Amino acid sequence: LDQLLNEHFAGRVVRKDLTKLIKEGANVPVYVLEYLLGMYCASDDPEIIEQGLRNVKTVLAENYVRPDEAEKVKSLVRERGSYKVIDRVTVKLNERKDKYEASFSNLGIKDAEISAGIVKEYEKLLVGGIWVIATLSYYFEEGQTSSPFGVSLLKPIQMPNMNMDELFSGRAALSTDQWRESLIRSIGMEPASLKEDVQWHLLARMVPFVENNYNVCELGPRGTGKSHIYKECSPNSILVSGGQTTVANLFYNMSSRRIGLVGLWDVVAFDEVAGISFKDKDGVQIMKDYMASGSFARGREQMEASASMVFVGNINQSVESLVKTSHLLAPFPEAMIDSAFFDRFHAYIPGWEIPKMRPEFFTNRYGLIVDYLAEFFREMRKRSFADSIEKYFKLGNNLNQRDVIAVRKTVSGLMKLLYPHGQFNKEDVRQCLEYALQVRRRVKEQLKKIGGMEFYDVHFSYIDNDTLEEHFVSVKEIPEGPAKPGFLYTIGLSNKGMPGLYRLELQVTKGSGKLATSGLWNSSSAKEQVKIAFDYFKANASRISGGSKVMEHDFHLHVVELQNTGPLSHLALPSLVAFASGLLGRSVQSQMVVLGDMSLGGSVTPVESIAECLQVAFDAGAKKVALPMSSAADIPTIPVELFTKFQTSFYADPVDAVFKGLG
Amino acid sequence: KELDQLLNEHFAGRVVRKDLTKLIKEGANVPVYVLEYLLGMYCASDDPEIIEQGLRNVKTVLAENYVRPDEAEKVKSLVRERGSYKVIDRVTVKLNERKDKYEASFSNLGIKDAEISAGIVKEYEKLLVGGIWVIATLSYYFEEGQTSSPFGVSLLKPIQMPNMNMDELFSGRAALSTDQWRESLIRSIGMEPASLKEDVQWHLLARMVPFVENNYNVCELGPRGTGKSHIYKECSPNSILVSGGQTTVANLFYNMSSRRIGLVGL
Amino acid sequence: GIWVIATLSYYFEEGQTSSPFGVSLLKPIQMPNMNMDELFSGRAALSTDQWRESLIRSIGMEPASLKEDVQWHLLARMVPFVENNYNVCELGPRGTGKSHIYKECSPNSILVSGGQTTVANLFYNMSSRRIGLVGLWDVVAFDEVAGISFKDKDGVQIMKDYMASGSFARGREQMEASASMVFVGNINQSVESLVKTSHLLAPFPEAMIDSAFFDRFHAYIPGWEIPKMRPEFFTNRYGLIVDYLAEFFREMRKRSFADSIEKYFKLGNNLNQRDVIAVRKTVSGLMKLLYPHGQFNKEDVRQCLEYALQVRRRVKEQLKKIGGMEFYDVHFSYIDNDTLEEHFVSVKEQLIPEGPAKPGFLYTIGLSNKGMPGLYRLELQVTKGSGKLATSGLWNSSSAKEQV
């Protein structure tokens, strides 16, 4: 680290614990002090550090001269011929005369003459005005139209320049994990005191600075630093507090013919999303258009913006309570509950997973300068890596086009942020892809929760191009009581043969008897089993439903796996039970377990691994199970203690199984 | 495969495999047509390696250009001491009667009166329509009281589409059968005619019909997910999509205050 | 612009464009100039207690007629004139001259009253594109904090942002200011009655009483401890020119003394980042006022550390009373880098309360690690949860944690 940090990087030698222990009770932007210490304080000698700190403070309150008596300084310039001052200076080129001019944001001189060589040396004077030390010279000739003030010496107290090849060399030299730790410590966090996944979340927090139109939301408990980070990285992020910004102010002032906030900054972050208000309703809709493409039509003209949106919000409830009672985006007001708004959220950063900010979580080694961070995030702000995954992996069929786009953008962001050199292996792509799939699947789950059946495809997966294995990522982080009709739980041996619990959800609609399947993980065996069960249900509709017509009701069944055991083949009997329950509108028994499979003729098959199935039901928190008569000979094979824990609704055939499940 | 070779020969430079664009139609500050032109000229037929290398070249070039407005002034300064800094930029060029000199305007950099030789404009054209994304190697010279911006275009290449060559259609159309032309038009949207019933292809063509008839009022209504939203917002740059329904007769038709025609005129 | 006697002369020539009036002799009735090192020489020359007495004379107060802690309160009153963006509140009974110091002890300080205080006038006039009072003065003080108001509904949050960091956005542009925020208020009740049935800042109106904002204060000056102003408290000796002290505070504001702490007495773990910043800034201001030349010892750091850890602990316990769960961390841990002795400071505000307490609170008596009996109070809060136990206030005692 320290050796690499001093060699493979410029004078970025500042703890950022130093800055907090620096006299941050004065008048200067913090990163100016940071650059000051980065040069006058190197190595690790405490004495040198303290002496450089003293020198920084002395040069600070030697030539600051606050705005009030600006003209006073001018006198010293005229009387002494030359004078030294510290100020934020901007340099512009006057095409009418080709003579570089200097504007002081503090002293108020807008036309000081500066040499062209110095202009070539420091490009950052040429972008937005940088803090520098100036040597003002006074020269007045009769009849002159130019300024009498000239700058002979300029000292770039803030930032000299950016060099991309330096970043490339540093990344190539630095190891992956060490480079990630360096990035995290550049935020001021201690990677050693923190878990890997939280560092992944911190990288996700920097992602808004490295991709265009990165619509991301983070809701979580207080103390996670979700407000501070954007407060130091403000050079290209905005912390809009309370939502006090109108569509004219935020997007485009039609009166002044000037673009809004989104057109000037690279990131905008709404703090306390619970309190934001966009006044007129129309904004929300045009908001959507921005969320759609990053470009919005106002009046007669379309403006495109490169600002990425962050939604920072505070959570007052426990995670499990909010999950079970509502959607995770509950802090969002009613103006945003619409799935038509939430759908473009590229990521939901898990603010609860972030530990509360404590001193042990703050790095003290050193770390890069946040200036370097943002100013190369500007480089990452343009380059894309969307095509990397196509060489190694393919997205599953359960993700729509928007999900694919969001995942690609998240992966490209993460990886370039972590691989400026590129490190184009397969494992890094796999890691970024799985993390993006997880964060997008949480949003997809919230979308399903809010919108009903319109987002039933939540089973995020990726297929390896070489091994053909489809890895199914699952959301991070059997309930008591009678569930709604059409929902049940079953236990079966997956294609690999271990017992697993699966949940089947049937949705009934008015229609012509069509059958729709979802969550079958591209399993033809499951599809044909469900088809056989549907044929049996249609054939025996009169006796089972007592008159309710299958031909008048449309069924859409979804299968979800909770243990990730693998695809299951045996599904005819539980699907038939779900069909009967949904058609009758009667809730199945609470904690009821349906076991076994059936033929189209109504014959029952013995439950394979019945002991392990009952063990899973014990692990599934259920108290009831239905078994066919063919499993009776397997009763002695089961230990007595486990068998006594269940009310065995021992059925004979599919019809009896349906009756026992329905009670 | 015969259709692919017909498209490559008869419509050379005007046909590209649309799938590739979907690969990189995200994560940039550049419109789709720029890439849609940046792939047809490096990807020859179906070569994987050449296609990937072309992607690399496009990415590398883009990683150097379309410089953001914020540092605009900055680049000009470098210009004064080194000169040539070719940039991908949306450029609009106008003819000044008094000056008799084409007067290029940069949408991003803010330069409004750069000079371009008539030789450059007469070939490329499409600059004098609405401004297009082009690469510009810029030429510079300062003169006392030049009464003009010391900004000039030494070299240019249209990163967008050059002029149209209508004739190529007719003969090209004579080279394809009716159903083949129908399938080609459907694949031009990126749809699969083989995966779609012929009547649905008729309906998809009916979707494109509004773009060849003046005042062709049409109504499409249906369940979500029919692609009616993707079309008319990315299948055309000369058509506009209105979302939300919030419009004024001033914006759509004519603003009596500004003496300006509404959206219907642009 | 300084009041002067001018010997104006008239000389007119035909065709001239300059004024015919010429100034031959000038008599600077206000003040010629000021050498920075001139005060430093005297500061190095004189002792610390003498320096504090001279500063007290500079207000016109008699240090001999007042207590040492009263002199410390007056020094805290001076601190806003020396610290940039120094958010401070003084609330107390009438007769302590709270508004006198911000009205007549500095021409670089403004005492705003009336309460209308529009954000256009106060902060930025978007119509005129011009800065408000905060950009032109050095010490802005709301008198009659009870009577303050805000026409713009967002003005409160603008104030919160300004005191959080001396730079606030304005519609579409972030402006900044260096004027120190002062809140002067009158108390109509006895100290105990007011602070027991409510919080200290009860005179502050409901619209701005809150968890934050009140957080942003760098000091609460306990105005009740100051006696009512009497002629016996008024000095008649030599005193520094109020212009001289004001301009000295002018060049002092660009200095800071926050970094002497790290070489010396440490700080505790119960203070959050905001508490750390507030105490560092207050300590810095006290050193600037008392040791502007920079010659000081470690006990000199102690002198201001104790007073800062007291004044900020007062605000900490007020925020505790206001908010509950977030701000029980009031145990201000005074620590040393050398002795490692963990001292503690308790505000004079801070045996067993009578009557039936709310359930979950009790009192115990035990032999501390030093072996003498002592009284402790345990407060238990019950919440809906999963049986988790959280402990605090144990002063990192592992044996106590194990017994709990």
3-state secondary structure of B177: coil
Fold of A487-662: Ribosomal Protein S5; domain 2 (3.30.230)
How wide is the angle at C-alpha B256 spanned by C-alphas B250 and B257, nearest 5°?
A: 100
C254 to A57: CB separation less than 8 angstroms, yes or no? no
Token pair recorded at residue A265: 């900054």
Q: Judged by CB atoms within 8 Å, which residues 573-632 of A form the interface with B? A: none
- Closest-CA distance, C133 to chain A, in angstroms, reads 13
- Cβ contacts below 8 Å, chain A against chain B, sum to 91
Distance from CA of C305 to the nearest CA of A (A): 16
Hey, are the CB atoms on A92 and B70 less than 8 Å from each other?
no
Structural resolution in Å: 3.6
Q: Is A181 helix (H, G, I), strand (E, B) or coil?
A: helix
Coil, strand or helix: which one is B144? coil
Amino acid at C271: L
Rounded CA separation A275/C337 (Å): 45
Q: CB–CB of A328/A348 below 8 Å?
A: yes
Residues of A in contact with B142 (CB under 8 A): 98
* Inter-chain CB proximity B73 and A300 less than 8 Å: no
C131 three-state secondary structure:
strand
The Cα angle at residue B81 between residues B78 and B87, in degrees rounded to 5: 45
Burial class (CB in 10 A: 0-12, 13-18, 19+), C328: middle
C 258-287 → A contacts, CB under 8 A: 258-259, 262-263, 269, 273, 276-277, 280-281, 284
CA distance C322 to A653: 67
Chain A residues lying within 8 Å of C257, measured CB to CB:
23
Please check whether residue B26 touches A, CB under 8 A: yes
Which residue among A127, A299, A405 sits closest to B26, beta carbon to beta carbon? A405
C-alpha R_g of chain B = 22
For residue C185, which phi and psi values (nearest 5 degrees)?
-140, 155
Q: Which of C131, C248, C255, C270 to mutate to test the interface with A (most CBs of A within 10 A)?
A: C255
- CA dist list (Å): C43 to C39, C248, C284, C298: 6, 12, 17, 18
Tell me which chain B residues have a C-beta less than 8 angstroms from the C-beta of A123.
Answer: 71, 74, 77-78
C-beta of residue A74 within 8 angstroms of C-beta of residue A87: no
- A61: nearest CB among C169, C254, C281: C254
How far B27 CA sits from the closest chain A CA (Å)?
5
A29/A151 Cα distance (integer angstroms): 23
Residue pair A576/A654 in contact (Cβ under 8 Å)? The answer is yes
Tally A–C CB contacts below 8 A: 60
Number of H helices, E strands in chain A: 24, 26
Enumerate the residues of chain B whose CB falls inside 8 A of the CB of residue A299. Answer: 251
Measure the CA–CA gap between A586 and A548, rounded to whole angstroms. Answer: 13
Asked whether the beta carbons of residue A23 and residue C84 sit closer than 8 angstroms, the reply is: no
Q: What is the DSSP letter of A482?
A: P
Q: What share of chain A is helix, strand, coil (3-state, %, to 5)?
A: 40, 20, 40
Closest listed residue to residue C119, CA positions, set A258, A244, A234, A231: A244
Is there contact between B and C if contact means ≥3 C-beta pairs under 8 Å?
no
Neighbours of chain C (3+ CB pairs under 8 A): A
* DSSP E strand boundaries for A165-224: 216-220
Q: Is A473 on the interface with B (CB under 8 A)?
A: no
Q: Do C256 and A249 touch (CB under 8 A)?
A: no
Nearest C-alpha neighbor of C79 from the set C282, C339, C296, C344: C282
CB-CB under 8 Å, A241 with C284: no
**A191 exposure class (CB count in 10 Å sphere: 0-12, 13-18, 19+):** buried
Mutate to test the interface with B, among A300, A339, A388, A456 (most CBs of B within 10 A): A300
Distance CA C300, CA C289 (A): 12
Cβ-contact A243, A276 below 8 angstroms: yes
- Put simply, the chain C residues between 59 and 98 with a CB less than 8 A from any chain A CB are 83-84
**Can you tell me whether residue C3 is helix, strand or coil?**
coil
Exposed, middle or buried: residue B82 (CB in 10 Å: 0-12, 13-18, 19+)? exposed
3-class secondary structure, A83: strand
Distance CA C287, CA C293 (A): 9
Instruction: Please tell me which residue of chain A has the smallest CA distance to C281.
Output: A25
User: What one-letter code names the amino acid at B61?
Assistant: V
By CA distance, what is A239's nearest residue in C? C169
Residue B28: which of A382, A390, A405 has the nearest Cβ? A382
Contact B40, B160 (CB under 8 A): no
Q: Which of B1, B20, B46, B3 is nearest to B183 (CA)?
A: B3
Side chain identity, residue B160: Q
CA A564 to chain C, closest CA, distance in angstroms equals 27
Number of H helices, E strands in chain C: 11, 15
Residue C307: both structure tokens together: 């007073």
Residue in chain B nearest A391 by alpha carbon: B52
Question: Judging by beta carbons within 10 Å of its beta carbon (0-12, 13-18, 19+), is residue B142 exposed, middle or buried?
Answer: exposed
Instruction: Give the distance from residue A449's alpha carbon to the nearest chain C alpha carbon, in angstroms.
Output: 24
User: Does residue C212 sit at the A interface (CB-CB below 8 Å)?
Assistant: no
CA dist C381 and C360 (Å) reads 7
Residue that has been written with the tokens 């401070």 in this structure: C88
DSSP-based three-state secondary structure for A582: helix
- Judging contacts by C-beta atoms under 8 Å, the chain B residues touching residue A212 are 27-29
Specify the DSSP element, H or E, that contains C111: strand C109-112
Nearest-CB residue to A64 (from C254, C281, C385): C254
3-state percent helix, strand, coil for chain C, nearest multiple of 5: 35, 15, 50
DSSP A303: E
Q: Dig out the tokens for C393 from the structure.
A: 């206030």
Q: What angle do CA A440, A442, A448 make, to 5 degrees?
A: 105
Look up tokens 């309370």; give the residue: A242
Instruction: For chain C, give the longest Cα–Cα distance.
Output: 100
Question: Quick one: which of A604, A656, A592 has its CA closest to A634?
Answer: A604
Residue B98 burial (10 A CB sphere; 0-12, 13-18, 19+): exposed
- The Cα B28–Cα A380 span in angstroms is 10
**Chains in contact with A, counting 3 or more C-beta pairs less than 8 Å apart as contact:** B, C
Instruction: Give the count of beta carbons closer than 10 Å to the beta carbon of residue B192.
Output: 9
Coil vs helix vs strand at A258: strand
Closest CA to B159 of B131, B199, B139: B131
Query: Which among A120, A288, A297 has the least Cβ separation from residue B81?
Result: A120
According to DSSP, the β-strands at A82-92 and A130-138 are: antiparallel
Cβ separation A25–C281 shorter than 8 A? yes
Contact B26 A383 (CB under 8 A): no
In sequence order, the 6+-apart residues with CB closer than 8 A to the CB of A111 are A101, A102, A103, A146, A147, A149
* Shortest Cα distance, chain A CAs vs residue B252, angstroms: 8
Closest CA to A381 of B85, B67, B23: B67
DSSP C234: B
CA-nearest residue to C385 within chain A is A318
Length of chain B: 266
Tell me how crowded residue A263 is: count the other CB atoms within 10 A of its CB.
16
Do residue C277 and residue A53 have CB atoms under 8 angstroms apart?
no
Q: Are strands A515-518 and A624-627 parallel, antiparallel or unpaired?
A: unpaired
3-state secondary structure C354-392: CCCCCCCEEEEEEECCCCCEEEEEEECCCCCCCCCCCCC
* Method used to determine the 3D structure: cryo-EM
Kindly list the residues from chain B whose CB atom is less than 8 angstroms away from the CB atom of residue A379: 63
Chain position carrying tokens 């450029």: B91
Question: CB–CB of A413/A214 below 8 Å?
Answer: yes
3-class SS string, A607-658: CCCHHHHHHHHHHCCCCEEEECHHHHHHCCCCCHHHHCCCEEEECCCHHHHH
- Per DSSP, helices labelled H in C217-335 are 242-253, 273-290, 298-323
Answer yes or no: do A91 and B77 touch at CB < 8 A: yes
**In whole angstroms, what is the distance from residue C203 CA to residue C219 CA?**
17
The reply to whether C161 touches chain A by the CB within 8 Å rule is yes
Decide if C180 contacts C218 (C-beta within 8 A): no
Taking the CA atoms of residue A613, residue A618, residue A623 and residue A628 in that order, the dihedral angle to the nearest 10 degrees is 10
A263: its two tokens: 């057109």
Chains C and A touching, counted as 3 or more CB pairs less than 8 Å apart:
yes
Chain C positions touching A261 (Cβ under 8 A) are: 172
Check if A416 contacts B (Cβ < 8 Å). Answer: no
Alpha carbons A622 and A616: distance in angstroms, whole number: 9
The beta-carbon neighbor of C157 closest among A21, A22, A241 is A241
Judge: B27–A98 Cβ closer than 8 Å, yes or no.
no
Q: Report d(CA A557, CA A555) in Å as an integer.
A: 6
CB C50 within 8 A of CB C92: no
β-bridge pairing B254-255 and B152-158: unpaired
Angle, helices C68-78/C48-59, rounded to nearest 10 degrees: 70
User: What six digits make up the tokens of B131?
Assistant: 């401004």
